[PDB]
Design a protein around this ligand. Structure first.
Ligand SMILES: O=C(O)CCC(=O)C(=O)O
Ligand SMILES: [Mn+2]
Length: 200
DNA sequence: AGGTAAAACGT
DNA sequence: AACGGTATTACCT
C-alpha cells in the first residue's frame, strides 16, 4: 500500500495470485462481448481495444461518452461481472480504504504494443476507481485536477492494483505507449480492469 | 449557465 | 520525447 495521492494508493502485486483466473474470465467475457477499438466522437479509432462486463459499460458514440447497459456491437447486455472480478475488486477496495465500494461496471482494456491512453479524467456519484494491471508492464501517468498539473509516472506490473477516490477521484491519468515484450500469461499484451460505480 | 468533447499534433 | 495546445468553441440541456 504506497501513498500515490490523497485518497489514492498502489497495491503492488495485489492481484498476482488471482491473475490466472482473472485472465480466464477476461476470455469468457470477450467471447460474448468482443474486444473492439472504439471510435471517438471526433472520428479517431482508439489504440486500446475495449469491452465491458457488469450492468454498465463505457462506450463512445457520436454524441459523447456513455455508460450503457447494452453493448452497441452485439445489441445485448454486457456479460455479467465475473465473481473473480467482483471478489478481487472488493478485496482491493477494502485494502485501499474503500470498504463500501460496490461496482456495477468493469471496463476491460487490452493494450497491444504501441497502444496508449492519453491523459483523461474518469467522469460520470462519488465512488472510487479500482484499476487492475495484467500482463506486460506499462507506464501509468497520474496527475492532478488540471491537465497541466505535474505527473507522477509509475511502472505498473502484472498484478498491480491502483485505487483512487475522494480528493483524487477526478485526477487526470493515462498510459504511455506500450513497449513490446513477453509475459507468460498474456503472451504479448497488457490488460487492465477498471471497476466503477457508474449507476445509482 | 454549465458540462462535454480531446480516453484525440507541434515543439 | 516530455510537455502542452486545442475546446481561446460548438452544441447540448
Ligand atoms: O490501463 C490503465 O491502467 C488505465 C485505464 C483507464 O484509465 C481507463 O480505462 O479509464
Ligand atoms: Mn481512466
Amino acid at each position: 500500500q504506497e501513498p500515490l495521492a490523497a485518497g489514492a494508493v498502489i497495491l503492488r502485486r495485489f492481484a498476482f495470485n488471482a491473475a490466472e483466473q482473472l485472465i480466464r474470465d477476461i476470455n469468457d467475457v470477450a467471447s460474448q462481448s468482443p474486444f473492439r477499438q472504439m471510435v471517438t466522437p471526433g472520428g479517431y479509432t482508439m489504440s486500446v481495444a475495449m469491452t465491458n462486463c457488469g450492468h454498465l459499460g463505457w462506450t463512445t458514440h457520436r454524441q459523447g461518452y456513455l455508460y450503457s447497459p447494452i453493448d452497441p456491437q452485439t445489441n445485448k447486455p454486457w456479460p455479467a461481472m465475473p465473481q473473480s472480478f467482483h471478489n478481487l475488486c472488493q478485496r482491493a477496495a477494502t485494502a485501499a480504504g474503500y470498504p463500501d465500494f460496490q461496482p456495477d461496471a468493469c471496463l476491460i482494456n487490452r493494450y497491444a504494443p504501441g497502444a496508449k491512453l492519453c491523459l483523461h479524467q474518469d467522469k460520470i456519484l462519488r465512488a472510487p476507481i479500482v484499476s487492475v494491471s495484467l500482463g506486460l508492464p506499462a507506464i501509468f501517468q497520474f496527475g492532478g485536477l488540471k491537465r497541466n498539473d505535474p505527473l507522477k509516472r509509475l511502472l505498473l506490473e502484472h498484478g498491480d492494483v491502483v485505487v483512487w477516490g475522494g480528493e483524487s477521484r477526478l485526477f487526470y491519468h493515462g498510459i504511455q505507449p506500450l513497449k513490446a515484450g513477453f509475459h507468460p500469461l498474456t503472451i504479448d499484451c497488457r490488460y487492465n480492469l477498471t471497476f466503477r460505480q457508474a449507476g445509482k
